[PDB]
Design a protein around this nucleic acid. Sequence first.
RNA 1: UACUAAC
RNA 2: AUACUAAC
RNA 3: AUACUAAC
RNA 4: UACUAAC
Lengths: 122, 124, 116, 125
Amino acid sequence: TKFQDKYYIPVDQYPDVNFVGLLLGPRGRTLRKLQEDSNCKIAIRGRGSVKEGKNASDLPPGAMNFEDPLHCLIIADSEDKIQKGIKVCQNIVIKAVTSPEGQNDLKRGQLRELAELNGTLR
Amino acid sequence: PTKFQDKYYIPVDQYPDVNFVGLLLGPRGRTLRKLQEDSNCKIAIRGRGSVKEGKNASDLPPGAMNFEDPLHCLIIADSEDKIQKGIKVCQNIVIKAVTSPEGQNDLKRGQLRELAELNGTLRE
Amino acid sequence: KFQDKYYIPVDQYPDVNFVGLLLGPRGRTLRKLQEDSNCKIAIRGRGSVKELPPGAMNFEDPLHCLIIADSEDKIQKGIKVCQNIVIKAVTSPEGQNDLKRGQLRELAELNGTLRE
Amino acid sequence: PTKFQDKYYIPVDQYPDVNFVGLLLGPRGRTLRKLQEDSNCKIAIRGRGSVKEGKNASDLPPGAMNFEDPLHCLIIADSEDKIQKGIKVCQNIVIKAVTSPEGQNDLKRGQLRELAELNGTLRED
RNA sequence: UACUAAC
RNA sequence: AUACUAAC
RNA sequence: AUACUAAC
RNA sequence: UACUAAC
């Protein structure tokens, strides 16, 4: 439990992009999968990490600070696993700012799947 | 000065959500007439999808209510070489729309900016 | 019967092998296009012949797909199938063109040189 | 005045065909000297891939031969904000590289042109 | 990137 | 338009 | 018929 | 991604 790192989301450059939803996916399924991929605990934190709002009740201890910019806090019990977390977190942000019209297949899946989980599906 | 024409079809079925007509026209039609300058062609956006619901037909030029074809650029010039340069510069418009993330479109980013200025609304 | 030319954005994309992507191994991709659309489609113009038919040996135009069919419905279909490829060619990241990928793999497999 | 650091990792895995080091450095290192003045940090390119094959070690600054991490920009400032700007300034170059199709990379264009000037081998042609 | 309308 | 960059 | 995602 | 060549 000795290693960690902060991957900073380029929000100042892409103020338009919903990075947080993308990384999370429906019910957080996309983030938990990133964690299995990298074998890291990943937590999205800092400025704008919280949408407003559900009660501060039952919320993560120390998720509520917004003076450090938006980042994924990645944690692993090994150094090379950290590099994997950054890697997998990078891939999501790369999907965001390199994907041409209608070709973010991940966001498509997430929204389709989100609807599936809501009974609001097509 | 005998004229001819050709059609550049827009990939509408592929990109249903995309507003190609406004991309090619730009604020006050400026983007279009810019292409007409670059190419030495007259360009008309024609076909199904080229006129609004519910436009007054007497505000439209001859041939604009021809809907035998889907949305296209009609390229008019007195030479083959001119015509293919018209298709080209329209192609460059459509291709940039199709290969853009959702924020890297400097044309559209620019067009909308210009529109704000004319309507006096440049926020930031 | 009806006839149309679909020009390839070669000038915009100077180092993209469009024709090879259009044709596929043995000409199989283009033949899929011709049946997906019901059109007769030929690659013509400067670049249609490697470094035909009547009249396939004429190149006083730039590179295009000449699309021919009995209906305008069909002509429109032939346009978008050629369009699909060009946009895939252009919107697919390198290494990530599925179509191109499967074409060189089928070609190796056809020439009997498939790697594991 | 105490100084601290942070690292910005380059997507070399995802983009193995791309010379990020060359892109960040520019001619005579001038591109990277510009990032330092904007951000008000000192920025060094370090990690595996930062040092060319056969490089004479006697020509490298302290720490340059530390290879336990992949390629990254190392940013050293005396405040969090300055480092934040360091990261942001290096991040912008990498986005440019990655989000530019063929011959659309304008900074790279400029650098190659600036390098041509500098070495009397230009062709504005 | 304020959602564009020419001939 | 791509001259492929090498700082500390 | 990209349904705009909220994990710990 | 073995780099395709049909009519």
